[PDB]
Amino acid sequence: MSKITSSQVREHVKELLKYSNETKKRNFLETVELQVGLKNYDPQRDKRFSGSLKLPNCPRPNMSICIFGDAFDVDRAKSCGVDAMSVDDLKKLNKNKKLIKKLSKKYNAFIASEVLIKQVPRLLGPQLSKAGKFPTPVSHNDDLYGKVTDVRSTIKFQLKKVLCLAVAVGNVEMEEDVLVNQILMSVNFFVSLLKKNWQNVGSLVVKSSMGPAFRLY
Amino acid sequence: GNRKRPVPKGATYGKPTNQGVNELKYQRSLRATAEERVGRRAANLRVLNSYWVNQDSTYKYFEVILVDPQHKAIRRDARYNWICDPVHKHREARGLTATGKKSRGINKGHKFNNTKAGRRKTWKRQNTLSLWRYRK
Amino acid sequence: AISKNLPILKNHFRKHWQERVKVHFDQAGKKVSRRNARATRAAKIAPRP
Amino acid sequence: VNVPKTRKTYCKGKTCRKHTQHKVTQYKAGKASLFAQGKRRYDRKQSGFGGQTKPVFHKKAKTTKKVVLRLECVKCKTRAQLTLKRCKHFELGGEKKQKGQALQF
Amino acid sequence: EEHTFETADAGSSAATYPMQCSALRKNGFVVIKSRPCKIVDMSTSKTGKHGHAKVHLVAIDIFTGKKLEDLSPSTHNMEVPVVKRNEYQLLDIDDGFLSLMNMDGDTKDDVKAPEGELGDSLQTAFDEGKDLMVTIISAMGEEAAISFKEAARTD
Amino acid sequence: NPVDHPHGGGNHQHIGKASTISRGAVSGQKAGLIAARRTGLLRG
RNA sequence: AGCGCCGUGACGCAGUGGAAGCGCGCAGGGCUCAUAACCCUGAUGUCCUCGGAUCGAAACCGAGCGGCGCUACCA
RNA sequence: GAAGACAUUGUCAGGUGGGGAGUUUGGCUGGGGCGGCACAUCUGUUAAACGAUAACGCAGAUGUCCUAAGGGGGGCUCAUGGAGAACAGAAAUCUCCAGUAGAACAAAAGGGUAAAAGCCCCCUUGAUUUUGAUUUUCAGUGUGAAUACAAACCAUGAAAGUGUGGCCUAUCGAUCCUUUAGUCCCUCGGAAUUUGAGGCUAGAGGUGCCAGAAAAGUUACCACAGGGAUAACUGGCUUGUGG
RNA sequence: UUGACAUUGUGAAGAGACAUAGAGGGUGUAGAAUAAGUGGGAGCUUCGGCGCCAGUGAAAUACCACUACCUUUAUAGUUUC
RNA sequence: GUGAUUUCUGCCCAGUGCUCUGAAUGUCAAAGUGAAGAAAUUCAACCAAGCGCGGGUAAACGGCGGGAGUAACUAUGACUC
RNA sequence: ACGGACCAAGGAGUCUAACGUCUAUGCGAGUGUUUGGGUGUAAAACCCAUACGCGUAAUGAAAGUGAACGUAGGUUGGGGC
Ligand SMILES: C[C@@H]1C[C@@H]([C@H](O)CC2CC(=O)NC(=O)C2)C(=O)[C@@H](C)C1
Ligand SMILES: [K+]
Ligand SMILES: [Mg+2]
Ligand SMILES: [Mg+2]
Ligand SMILES: [Mg+2]
Ligand SMILES: [Mg+2]
Ligand SMILES: [Mg+2]
Ligand SMILES: [Mg+2]
Ligand SMILES: [Mg+2]
Ligand SMILES: [Mg+2]
Ligand SMILES: [Mg+2]
Ligand SMILES: [Mg+2]
Ligand SMILES: [Mg+2]
Ligand SMILES: [Mg+2]
Ligand SMILES: [Mg+2]
Ligand SMILES: [Mg+2]
Ligand SMILES: [Mg+2]
Ligand SMILES: [Mg+2]
Ligand SMILES: [Mg+2]
Ligand SMILES: [Mg+2]
Ligand SMILES: [Mg+2]
Ligand SMILES: [Mg+2]
Ligand SMILES: [Mg+2]
Ligand SMILES: [Zn+2]
Questions:
Q1: What miscellaneous comment appears in this entry (chain B)?
Q2: Which of A36, A145, B112, D98 is the most buried (most CB within 10 A)?
Q3: Strands F33-34 and F20-21: what pairing?
Q4: What is the 3-state secondary structure (H, E, C) of chain D?
Q5: Residue of E8, E12, E77 with shortest CB distance to D25
């Protein structure tokens, strides 16, 4: 047994889906999320946990990611359908922080080739680190469609400064069996990153993009 | 309270198990100590019984019933002249009152196997090597 | 010490046991005494059995 | 050392009795769980006067431990324990080796 | 079928190894009162006229910088931590808490920025840029930044 | 000699440990300066 | 006799198996009538030798050299 | 007169406590001490051509490392030299010839291996289950390691076949206690149910003084039992050193 | 030495914690209003009013955010300094 | 502790000790409190002193460094690193 | 190397509980009277009931179950007849 049993989640998720699928018909997509709270836990004193796992299927394929990389990766990413940006156009963009301020905003994530290490910090500024989006490595043998599927599906848990975190673990328009599975994999992944496991969580809110933010515990 | 061990400066001279001074308990009750002191005070009488009457944090208070073995009202009156027998001299000093039989453990059953016919007598019997003429 | 193929013995003689040895030399005397007590009691309570 | 999280091996679960798929985890000891008879005896022996009553080990020599693998059949949930040799670093299902790759220095 | 994925840790092994007392050296590491320390002074003396040796040891804690002293017979064993240093590349430093990157792009946003004379100089050398390489010492479940170097080549 | 006093013994005459003694020390230990807030000559 | 440690730029010293760094010193220009201070810029190393293991050693191993040390007690 | 439900006193609980108590303070060792490890082990030699064989003999090594560096199959041949090919040079890649291994096989050393045991590639988990027998150390005990079958379930291959970890020789651990797995079994003894506890079979947590106590000194204030099994003076053998 | 219980009875006036709910932005520069944060993301309403874009910053603004402390507030009570 | 008089009694509070604060926090026993349980019990919060953190103190215990260059004969080095 | 000037007298593997191998004796699937009773020429000798010990059943942690397929098996030796 845990603090959460899949039965209680099964009954919250049903009317959570029944609201979005039946009642309110908005002209755009609806996304289900997970929000977590932390209690008796102090970011300044304690250890800032950091974890991510490969979620089985992507919660939202409608997010824009830019392919930093060398000639080989840009060549196989320009044919993929993902915006592949070179290394020699960034060469003197460091002149102005505004030139890269828009770069971080438009792309929901960044992944770069293994030559990112020497370059991406110093070629750019520290904005990407500040923004919470730092490029993740991709190898020459790693199929780039594999990473852009993986990096799009993975959820990252990070204790940055505040006791509240939130990862997105689905879109509404899936069948309900995989929704209860993934909402249940993400909660006990989150507790596994804590000192006392379930004894540090004090808030678990699951919901959909626009409506009834159900509390769980 | 407890019976502090009356060794000078707490220095017991022996093994660590016997190094205790403070958390040691007297094997007789305070009611038996009360009976001892009253019987010594009134050595011409025989302690019959005692009971609790009161207590505060420092003292427990008891009342002792004593019988006069010389009074002719007690020497006659068959229901009580057993106490005039010499065998009942200082029965409270030998643990023969109710509190003394309780502290000696004198009761029936398996819970009192150590102390039924007196524990030192039980120990002597259990620790006696009995040899017969035609050895068994 | 432990030596040879011999059974493990459990002779409980590590106390002052020689102070509590009872030898029943008085077996014959106490049997005579018991018969004497029975005879005197029979005489006292006669003819009760 | 690096061991996969998944492994096909023999399951003696009275319904498999054959090689089935297993999930691999590392064995963790578990809480000492007082009210165990040895813990009750120890508490009774340590109560009172007499000091420390049992040996207290001091002469540590080992620096590693044997790793025990907890194998769970995916068909009947029967579990089995396997023992590996001593190691300093142990990991499960991570970063299969790359053969012909340049050194990253 | 099953759930929760049985997420675990997959750990083992000791943070200290027992080696000796007389085999220690200055600039080596030793555990004193459960703290990791760097030896700066060790001396040996005979205890009597036909007795044996004892080692007096003076060492600085590798994290708090405090002096610790201890003494032991030269032939008993003491613990030595498994002190390790790691290269990282210096990304942003925002609320202290230097965010670092390994030889791969994997990030360590876990280590407090040093608040001492080395840490403030690190921040000043970081504000104008000139990407740094910071060394992290990580003995006995504690981590700390101890040095920083300007990259040599590839300007 | 050491049998007589905490300061006794030695191949030279010296106290050997701090002569400042805590208030919570026990009888036989309070030889020297007991619960001293400071020692040494006043005003340097 | 046995044992331990050290050797890095002219000097004093750091140093994470991926070709070496601090402070002065030195060099070039400037300011001054000139030197110093000051300002702007550069340069300086078989890491004591000679072999070995490693893809690659300043670090590890073997020797050789030069210094510093420690033990030296009961008789 | 002061003080007052506070102090005090009782019991339990945490701290402090060489003031005091009890105990300990390994072994081997050309006396002991300091040093070292010859204390559990492995390679070569000493070792005197079966086996065994000592020393604080000699030269070294071990407390690890590995999902492959384990298992099978396939294809190929290594170090090195010569001759050649823009930059390219003594050292970058390419080609041919010669090449018995002069390479490689995690790590000491020794042994072993060429259509392989090396290198590259394709699959995979036999590094599995149940026990018994055997070899070495040996008391023919344990522990560690290993060998050959049996009964299953598998991997690989066209197949013969091979595979019960690492090409072989080292790479490690009882009782008590704790913990997990298995049978879902046995017991809690007045009779049941459910917790809890205890059992049976098999792993782990560790004893490196490695057949496995829980352990700091000093003594010229010293004590006892002994020892010429053992040092310091004389004698004896030797004579490097001295002459 | 420190805490608790007992000894141990009789009383009042300022604080302060538990649970329900309503409130709340507190700032430096500056978008377009005075910005306490992080995740999602272009819609219901009589207002096209607001967000999207483009300017603005350390960080976007409609909306879902009864989520995250933090700062206040009125309770039938229950607890302590 | 030192040891008549005279004349002096330098520098060092990092360590060990002694001593003094705070409540901004870490550790934190028994009793008491809350929650889960059928209950034994388990978990959590609160949590005194001490410790920890931070000051003071050497007529407290005590301690009180290396190397190199440099003067118009050399040598030394007032000076300098 | 130590003990021994001389002589007399004394002066050191005992008894007990439990037990192993061997041997003797009795009876033998049984065996053991002597706790006790009876009796007596009285600590002897003689007589004795019921029990109890060991043995005739093992194995298992335990709940439990529990010894002939057969001339109580086959093969190889085997004294004696
Ligand atoms: C060191 C720890 C304990 C140790 C062991 O139980 C220690 C002793 C304790 C004792 O009093 N008697 C014994 O027979 C063993 C053990 O088994 C290790 C694996 C784990
Ligand atoms: K002693
Ligand atoms: Mg008790
Ligand atoms: Mg106690
Ligand atoms: Mg003292
Ligand atoms: Mg003393
Ligand atoms: Mg003297
Ligand atoms: Mg003592
Ligand atoms: Mg010895
Ligand atoms: Mg041994
Ligand atoms: Mg031979
Ligand atoms: Mg057990
Ligand atoms: Mg001799
Ligand atoms: Mg000569
Ligand atoms: Mg005086
Ligand atoms: Mg002075
Ligand atoms: Mg408590
Ligand atoms: Mg001194
Ligand atoms: Mg003699
Ligand atoms: Mg003589
Ligand atoms: Mg004589
Ligand atoms: Mg005689
Ligand atoms: Mg005799
Ligand atoms: Zn199965």
A1: There are 2 genes for eL15 in yeast.
A2: A36
A3: parallel
A4: CEECCEEEEEECCCCCCEEEEEEEEECCCCCCCECEHHHHHHHHHHCCCCCCCCCCCCCCCCCCEEEEEEEEECCCCCEEEEEEEEECCCEECCCCCCCCCCCCC
A5: E8
Asked whether A182 and A22 are in contact (CB, 8 A), the reply is no
Nearest Cα of chain D lies from the Cα of B110 at a distance, in angstroms, of: 23
Within 10 angstroms of residue E81's Cβ, the number of other Cβ atoms is 20
Instruction: Give CA–CA dist C40/D50, Å, rounded.
Output: 60
Q: Which amino acid is at A82?
A: V
Structure tokens at B79: 């229901």
d(C-alpha A57, C-alpha B81), whole Å: 101
Asked if D67 has any chain E CB less than 8 Å from its own CB, the reply is yes
Peptide bond into C47 cis (omega under 30): yes
Nearest atom in ligand 1 to D54's CA: 11
Q: Phi-psi category of E102—alpha, beta or left, where left has phi over 0 and alpha has psi -120 to 50?
A: beta
Q: D86 forms bridges with which residues in the sheet?
A: D66
Query: Nearest residue of B to residue C28 by CA position?
Result: B133
For residue E74, the CA-to-ligand 2 centroid distance in Å is 20
**What SS3 state is found at E99?**
strand
The identity of residue D43, as a single letter, is D
Separation of alpha carbons A215 and A202, rounded Å: 11
Say if residues A147 and A138 touch (Cβ distance below 8 Å).
yes
Distance CA D43, CA D37 (A): 10
Give the position of tokens 């207590």: B55
Residues sharing a CB contact under 8 Å with residue A101, sequence separation 6 or more, in sequence order: A127
Q: What does the alpha-carbon distance between residue A187 and residue A193 come to, in Å, rounded to a whole number?
A: 10
Report the relative pairing of strands A136-138 and A109-113 from DSSP bridges.
parallel
Does chain B reach chain C with at least 3 CB pairs under 8 Å?
Answer: yes
Q: Measured between alpha carbons, how far is residue E9 from residues A124, A192, D76 in Å?
A: 36, 9, 25
Q: Which CB contacts under 8 angstroms, 24+ apart, belong to E47-51? A: none
- Closest Cα of chain E to D37: distance in Å? 28
Say if B and E touch: at least 3 Cβ pairs within 8 Å. Answer: no
CATH for B1-136 is: 3.40.1120.10
Taking the C-alpha atoms of residue D21 and residue D5, their distance in angstroms, rounded to an integer, is 11
Distance CA(B34)–CA(B68), nearest Å, equals 18
From the CA of C19 to the C1' of K8: give the distance in Å.
Answer: 40
